[PDB]
Amino acid sequence: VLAPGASIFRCRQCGQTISRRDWLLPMGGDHEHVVFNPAGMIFRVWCFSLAQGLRLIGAPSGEFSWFKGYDWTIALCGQCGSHLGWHYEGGSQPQTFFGLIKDRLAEGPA
Ligand SMILES: O=C1CC[C@H](N2C(=O)c3ccccc3C2=O)C(=O)N1
Ligand SMILES: N[C@@H](CC(=O)O)C(=O)O
Ligand SMILES: [Zn+2]
DSSP states (O other), rough: OOOSSSSSEETTTTTOEEEEEGBOBBTTTTTTEEEEOOTOOOEEEEEOOOOEEEEEEEEOOTTTOSSSSOOOEEEEEETTTOEEEEEESEEEEEEEEEEGGGGEEEOOOO
């Protein structure tokens, strides 16, 4: 389409470019996964094949992973440090992907 407005995802706090709607990834048949951590926090996680602009912190862990076969690392906004989600690795088809917290991103034109 011409002049799309639902094209890219930026960090909600600072505007860093993070991902693209084209890169949404339907893990287990859905790009959206509603999940909770051990602290009881609920996240609406959108899975993306690719992302940029993040800083991945520490070494991977399999503990409490929401995605069978994958280990996670915390993904912060590389610009402002906002916690945007997790990077997943060590699994199969795909080996890696990103799970980003939908309400911590702003969607907009390319
Ligand atoms: O797949 C994941 C990513 C990490 C996530 N997670 C959290 O968000 C968290 C907060 C506090 C203590 C421990 C955890 C943890 O494993 C979680 O529970 N599963
Ligand atoms: N979508 C932008 C690229 C960006 O802002 O990251 C452009 O077409 O110039
Ligand atoms: Zn940011």
